[PDB]
Design a protein around this ligand. Structure first.
Ligand code: 8JG
Ligand code: 8JG
Ligand code: 8JG
Ligand code: 8JG
Ligand code: 8JG
Ligand code: 8JG
Ligand code: CL
Ligand code: CL
Lengths: 515, 515
């Protein structure tokens, strides 16, 4: 006779009763209290259901940040449906791929800034374009607009018994290979994530969070959109980051938190200097020194532990930053320890647990593990093999029990019989105090496929030779993993997106012979 | 392909890897680190499985507090079995009832203080006594002892795929009628409860909790045994409360928390005064003023909100104190608002939602709701009707959205066509500033079954008449709910257990004619 666990719908139904006059969401001139939000969600759900959307059905969002993203997630959630929050910077080929892959019943799109890509993509789909398209930033009466579609639904709550293990949020992720896959996050995934984040950040109903991170990425949901929603705080939306509008919203909405990277913080600070505008309610998590005393430094566990400075490990498929230095105290390893909804093992290629200090694939079980990728039957079977989710990230356990994240398992060398993970070698070299960064590649060898080569970037105030790098590796890693040679560079090549460009390293330094 | 949620077994498996040298449990001379505890749990699980215990099977604990209670819960949990932590003060009739009801495969019992009751109870069971009995506080080699049974198991983890919705902890509760029923708490119930409690109390791996509350009751598990376990802190066991031993453990184990009622606090303080023993690490939640500066006042949300002083509502069946003033800010209602794993509605007799201010039965859905009572098919069907758990507690929602707990729904008057809940009338009278407490009973009326009568206890420094009590009620409650007469008393009659004695009020004041 026992009932379901809590769903995202239950959260809104509770907030509308417990917090009748509190502001849930702000987006430009739109201000919605909990009951006004839940009413809109019910009307939206009514219209979605009238259009044939039910359990397991799919809605794709192709816009920037909006309060409507939260409405759509809640409304789909009340029907047991799911929303993909798409990457609004997709070019037409990638947008077409995602539309065909996800196969949505409904697409909610944005005109501003992306109408050209959208038009190109619909042209490409041709006779396969059978979804309903609704323009979110339309005139309010536009019959092909979101608001008109929503207004046509009734106030009644659908009141269905939705299983919270159902996917509700789908976020596309890219492998190093460039292959993209939609990670299925359930109600339970999001609630467990949000509950842990509320402990990490000391979040409560007085939190006012600026949704200045992209909602197509897990970061903004974890820190701090979903915990703010869960604890009945106020979510303030900005479409994307424009420093002046951000500053204005921080002040006008009295924000306590925001998702801001250091270059944005510096921009905000420069334009606020000697204006007298009060940013002191903002709890500075990232780059506290950059704020020049204008914000208050965060004293939550998130900041105190170093997690805010990157001391942790996670991925979309673990509902975000699931391992951190805020769990379990001081840590020799760079990532800390798993939080409450997760257990982690480091597994070798044979699926056996690695010894302390031995590098292997980070694998996980627990409430924060995603439900799999959408439409990836073979990949899912492989990646959930033996009842563990395989992250494709390489790590090790330290003697104190903490974890170190080394890099990906998807780069591998094979030198004669020996599999070698460059990430392990890179991390070893990067411990040398003269080294700022190191990239490891494989170069062809006619007798045993590949030799190991390191491309090393020194700190400006340091010097070290090829031989000294090689000897540094001797006591730390297996002999066959050491670089045969070392090239020095001023900096590594990087992609337009800021990631390491291994194709470029391979082209420059004679890389080849990979498995 | 997606996996299970987190189980209690996963918690111990993670802690043994992440916290290899930290102390998990202390009980007299026993000190167990996380790996030593998980090893014992694996040996215990091996022996339990060898004896035929598997999914859905049942172990009854008839002892006082022990580290072995945590071991048994974990070991049963790894098999998908459940442990009833019995009321060690049961007299033989109640002990026999519980044994026959719960029908355990194994009974782990305690000689000290209760051997006579146990012997009487086994005599009564006669030829129906077919369970294995293991003495927990035996000589270590006793072949009918717990330690010998455990030592015979192997170190291998059973490594089963246990559904965490499975009951793992069973706690007996008593209705006002005196009927006793075992509430089924799942792994998920306990973990969700523990996660919320860790936010409430700011619990982490440095917490050191003294298990000085009874483990047969939900209080000690919620505040703070289970969150301490979840966050990898140290649980220190005391068999029962003896002020001097408690004081010694608080100091020697450097406890940060304990489950202590005010009379016990005052006893500890009296015996610590001018000894110089340092109690300053203890975070005083209850009765902070009674500590005379010897402990540090708790600054967590639990204390700051008033929850620690009783501003909240819960029951075993909601995994404890599930509604509190720490959730959602200031509250007009005495109980506050529901925490994250719960939604609450106040429902009238017809199952429709009550208006703001109208008294009705507190009903719940969500992750913290129990799985039902053991062996109560008809009661469970009735109490989970319409997909809500019915608490049998009477409450109302206030205009600000908070909740007030009024009393039980199991006391009811029926005066002609009108159902009247005395708890509603009592709460109304108790708002009068002259009134310390009020009890309401029904007295026979030959024309319409019952009239309402109030028994009122005044504050010592106040005076108020019968008529003034009646007129106080006029604008606050329906006319037919007002007392027809008021008797004044120096204090209410109470049972040996400290609860109100309505049988005694009925006998003294002419009560009768109940539905
Ligand atoms: C602003 C960011 C982050 C938020 C999401 C984006 C999409 C946005 O425009 O709203 C984003 C834009 C990025 O080009 C940028 C800009 C700058 C700072 C962070 C991000 C950096 C490091 O060069 C990357
Ligand atoms: C987004 C995180 C978490 C998940 C895994 C990552 C790889 C990712 O990009 O998906 C990750 C990236 C981290 O730089 C970051 C960014 C921000 C917020 C969380 C994480 C914080 C605190 O500075 C750490
Ligand atoms: C915006 C992201 C994600 C999408 C693809 C990228 C390439 C991009 O610029 O569009 C990417 C850029 C990343 O520096 C960033 C920026 C910020 C937020 C997410 C990503 C974070 C966590 O620091 C990582
Ligand atoms: C100590 C308590 C609470 C813990 C569990 C008990 C069983 C125990 O002995 O360990 C318990 C004993 C109760 O008679 C008592 C004693 C005193 C203070 C609280 C409890 C009060 C109010 O008169 C009730
Ligand atoms: C045990 C609680 C919670 C559940 C429902 C109750 C009725 C019960 O006895 O079962 C409840 C009793 C409360 O006096 C108490 C006791 C202690 C700890 C929690 C609750 C605290 C903080 O002083 C509040
Ligand atoms: C010990 C309890 C529970 C069992 C039955 C009782 C009668 C008893 O004395 O044995 C009971 C006594 C309650 O005052 C108490 C004491 C403490 C802890 C639980 C119960 C709490 C929460 O303050 C309520
Ligand atoms: Cl739902
Ligand atoms: Cl398990």
């Amino acid at each position: 006779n026992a009932l379901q666990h809590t769903t995202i719908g239950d959260v809104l139904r509770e907030h509308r009763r417990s917090h009748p006059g509190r502001t849930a969401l702000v987006d430009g001139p739109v201000r919605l209290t909990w009951p006004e939000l839940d009413d809109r969600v019910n009307r939206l759900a009514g219209s979605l259901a009238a259009s044939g959307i039910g359990r397991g059905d799919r809605i794709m969002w192709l816009g920037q940040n909006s309060f409507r993203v939260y409405e759509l997630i809640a409304a789909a959630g009340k029907l047991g449906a799911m929303v993909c929050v798409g990457y609004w910077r997709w070019a037409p080929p990638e947008m077409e791929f995602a539309l065909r892959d996800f196969d949505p019943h409904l697409v909610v799109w944005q005109h501003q800034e992306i109408h050209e890509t959208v038009a190109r993509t619909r042209e490409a789909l041709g006779s396969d374009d059978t979804a309903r398209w609704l323009r979110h930033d339309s005139a309010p009466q536009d019959p092909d607009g979101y608001e008109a579609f929503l207004a046509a639904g009734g106030l009644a709550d659908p009141d269905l018994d939705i299983d919270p293990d159902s996917p509700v949020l789908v976020l596309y992720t890219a492998a190093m290979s460039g292959r993209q896959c939609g990670s299925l996050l359930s109600h339970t995934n999001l609630i467990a994530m949000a509950t842990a984040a509320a402990w990490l950040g000391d979040i409560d109903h007085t939190t006012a969070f600026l949704n200045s991170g992209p909602m197509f990425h897990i970061g903004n949901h974890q820190f701090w959109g979903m915990p703010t929603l869960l604890m009945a705080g106020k979510n303030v939306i900005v479409r994307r980051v424009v420093a002046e509008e951000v500053r204005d919203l921080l002040v006008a909405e009295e924000c306590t938190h925001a998702f801001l990277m250091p270059p944005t913080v510096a921009e905000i600070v420069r334009l606020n200097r000697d204006t007298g505008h009060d940013l002191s309610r903002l709890r500075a998590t990232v780059a506290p020194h950059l704020w020049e005393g204008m914000a208050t430094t965060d004293t939550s566990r998130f900041t105190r532990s170093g997690a805010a400075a990157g001391r942790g490990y996670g991925q979309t498929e673990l509902s975000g930053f699931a391992v951190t230095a805020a769990y379990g105290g001081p840590a020799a390893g760079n990532a800390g320890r798993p939080g409450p909804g997760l257990t982690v093992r480091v597994l070798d290629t044979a699926g056996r647990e690695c010894a302390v200090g031995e590098a292997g694939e980070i694998c996980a079980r627990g409430t924060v593990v995603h439900r799999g990728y959408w439409n990836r039957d073979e990949v899912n079977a492989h990646r959930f093999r033996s009842g563990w989710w395989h992250t494709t990230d390489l790590g090790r356990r330290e003697p104190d029990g903490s974890l170190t994240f080394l890099g990906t398992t998807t780069r591998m060398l094979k030198s004669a019989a020996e599999n070698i993970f460059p990430a392990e070698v890179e991390n070893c070299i990067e411990q040398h105090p003269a080294v700022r960064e190191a990239a490891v590649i494989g170069v062809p060898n006619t007798r045993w496929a590949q030799d190991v080569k390191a491309v090393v970037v020194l700190e400006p105030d340091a010097g070290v030779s090829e031989q000294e790098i090689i000897d540094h590796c001797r006591p730390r890693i297996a002999s066959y993993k050491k670089p045969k040679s070392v090239a020095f560079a001023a900096a590594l090549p990087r992609t337009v997106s800021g990631a390491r460009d291994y194709d470029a390293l391979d082209k420059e330094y004679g890389g080849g012979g990979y498995p």
